[PDB]
């Protein structure tokens with residue numbers, strides 16, 4: 106089952122500048138930073154709250170590491186802003202299979218590594234009324 | 246203080262069809278529906294989780310009631326997808342004044358009515374790295 110909003114994926118041109126914006130404006134602090142070279146992003150997670158399923162909700166700020174990447178292509182076309190939304194589940198493999206069986210395109214055969222060792226997959230935005238939708242199971 | 250992600254505002258052409266998509270695909274159900282004629286939207290709130298500040302996190306699906314509205318203009322330009330993000334606070338007036346004092350444009354002098362009697366205001370996307378950002382205090 107999808108039991109929380111896990112995060113909002115926000116694309117930006119300069120991760121350090123946009124991190125500073127969220128810290129200065131709202132008092133949000135950095136929970137974690139990492140590079141995902143497969144995905145072609147440098148990311149920062151800002152934790153906003155805990156959630157009733159035992160998880161948490163974050164802002165995931167993403168700067169592309171290369172133009173030839175999902176986020177690099179998207180920023181070039183659209184400018185900075187919301188790139189995707191992510192829902193948390195205790196079983197991404199099972200939930201992804203159930204959604205594949207409804208005819209919504211699941212972009213990975215098998216979940217891939219995401220933030221903080223999580224396992225993630227994506228649903229095609231053109232099957233989700235224009236919203237790139239991620240499914241995530243936390244490593245813990 | 247901004248203590249939760251309150252909701253994701255998602256624009257759609259057909260509220261009933263997009264509600265059905267979220268119900269069929271993810272098992273989300275409708276928590277509330279209402280029309281906001283000032284804002285020019287028909288909305289449905291889908292509750293995803295409760296949050297550690299005592300509040301909750303929703304998907305807010307929005308269909309325009311008129312072309313000449315924030316969401317009608319935006320859908321015509323961009324197609325369906327994420328329109329805004331909303332953060333919850335126990336004092337929208339105080340937090341909005343603190344953010345106005347940082348030079349981020351606050352679009353209302355005074356918070357206006359939002360979902361379920363909430364009081365809301367917005368920050369200009371061009372001051373927030375491309376993200377239309379709402380601040381909301383729940384009526385309870």
Ligand SMILES: CC(C(=O)SCCNC(=O)CCNC(=O)[C@H](O)C(C)(C)COP(=O)(O)OP(=O)(O)OC[C@H]1O[C@@H](n2cnc3c(N)ncnc32)[C@H](O)[C@@H]1OP(=O)(O)O)=[N+]([O-])[O-]
Nearest residue numbers: 114141144175176179188212219220227229230235236237
């Ligand atoms: C590490 C991690 C992350 O979140 S990494 C996040 C970055 N990685 C990802 O996004 C991977 C998944 N995304 C993708 O594979 C691709 O970007 C998509 C789903 C396949 C689209 O790739 P395409 O190469 O087909 O892009 P393309 O520009 O060709 O566009 C294909 C269609 O999708 C639309 N589209 C593309 N990106 C979109 C987005 N982010 N949201 C909504 N619509 C989108 C686009 O406007 C076009 O619509 P249109 O036909 O109406 O004009 N984490 O830890 O949580």
Ligand SMILES: CC(C(=O)SCCNC(=O)CCNC(=O)[C@H](O)C(C)(C)COP(=O)(O)OP(=O)(O)OC[C@H]1O[C@@H](n2cnc3c(N)ncnc32)[C@H](O)[C@@H]1OP(=O)(O)O)=[N+]([O-])[O-]
Nearest residue numbers: 254281284315316319328352359360367369370375376377
């Ligand atoms: C009831 C409720 C709701 O949430 S009601 C939600 C619907 N209402 C609202 O959005 C009200 C707040 N929004 C607004 O007043 C306006 O839409 C904005 C902030 C002023 C923009 O209005 P404008 O008439 O200036 O729009 P305009 O198309 O002229 O565009 C002005 C600039 O803002 C950008 N922009 C417009 N809408 C945007 C959005 N949703 N996200 C990001 N960028 C946006 C746009 O791309 C352009 O950038 P560019 O210059 O780089 O091209 N609730 O209960 O929670």
Ligand SMILES: [Cl-]
Nearest residue numbers: 140141142143
């Ligand atoms: Cl890596």
Ligand SMILES: [Cl-]
Nearest residue numbers: 280281282283
């Ligand atoms: Cl009304």
Ligand SMILES: [Co+2]
Nearest residue numbers: 114165191239
């Ligand atoms: Co993500």
Ligand SMILES: [Co+2]
Nearest residue numbers: 254305331379
């Ligand atoms: Co809203």
